[PDB]
Amino acid sequence: SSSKVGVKINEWYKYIRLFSVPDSEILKAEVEEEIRHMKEDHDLLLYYSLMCFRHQLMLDYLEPRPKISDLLEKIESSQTDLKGILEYYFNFFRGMYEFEQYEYLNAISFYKQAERKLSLVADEIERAEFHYKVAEIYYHMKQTHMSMHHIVQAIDSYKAHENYTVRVIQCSFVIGLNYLDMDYPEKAIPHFKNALDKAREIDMSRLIGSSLYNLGLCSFAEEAYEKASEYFKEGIRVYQDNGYEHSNRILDILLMLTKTTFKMRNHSEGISWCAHGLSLSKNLNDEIMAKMFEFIHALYVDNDNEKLNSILNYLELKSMLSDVEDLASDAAKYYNEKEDHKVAVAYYEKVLYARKQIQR
Amino acid sequence: RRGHTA
């Protein structure tokens, strides 16, 4: 009855990828009943601990000493003599975790280890998971061509099956966001409106609001800040009216709305938005998002270029060059309007430096 | 800011 547990853990992972929580809870229960009467295969035990971890990552996406850091504890104490697909799962899942912690280098390191084992992965849907997650981190690193390379592979496999809508939406996010990085907002809007339509079909509040956020990033790119300010606002109430008011990623939408309202020269409204966003980053214990709201504040409110510089260095040390570029670009532009062309030059150069670093 | 990819 040892393969009987392995088969059930596979089924468990099938349902996790399908975002069927009721089935995932059914399989997790059956597995835990089965482990009671099995004979301590340490690999089977680790397969179980990895699936628990992956199951928890699903649950934390759908609803935000957490169960996760306790589960991650169990995983690293048994990283001894790994081989085959279990080693692949180990590194893939570990890279996922590290990505959610803003540990981009760690995550890419883990993902590269998993990638070496890709030929062991018979399941096409499993390979698609890998390609999507890899594409995602490449996008966050502004590795646009690498991201596009992986994301096409994933979304082709997902679209070849049926109930992978959630992943298909997310792949549409990645592709669209890549086209944006290439200054094609008009090429990116189709993919986001497509995602928006599918997310309303399955009534996923999170995905709906992230579509608005991604669409607002287009208007913002087209300097249509009115329309951009709308998209951001509605996506924020989406997250808030549906139990996502404490998801870290709402800070993204707050941050860009704060930027947009300041660019609309609605100074006072812009203050009542950087505010909610500064305190929320404090509350959710996200140092990286807090320091991006500081940058906005020090820029449009304070002109404390010194702090601006200190934040830019921080974000570079954090391997978030894309945010370095975007923020230095906000600074450079704003000072250009204020005709402080001298220091406006300083930030234009920083933009050049970040763009160069991204290319290496 | 990066778009939402998840």
TrEMBL record, chain A:
This is Uncharacterized protein. It comes from the Viruses.
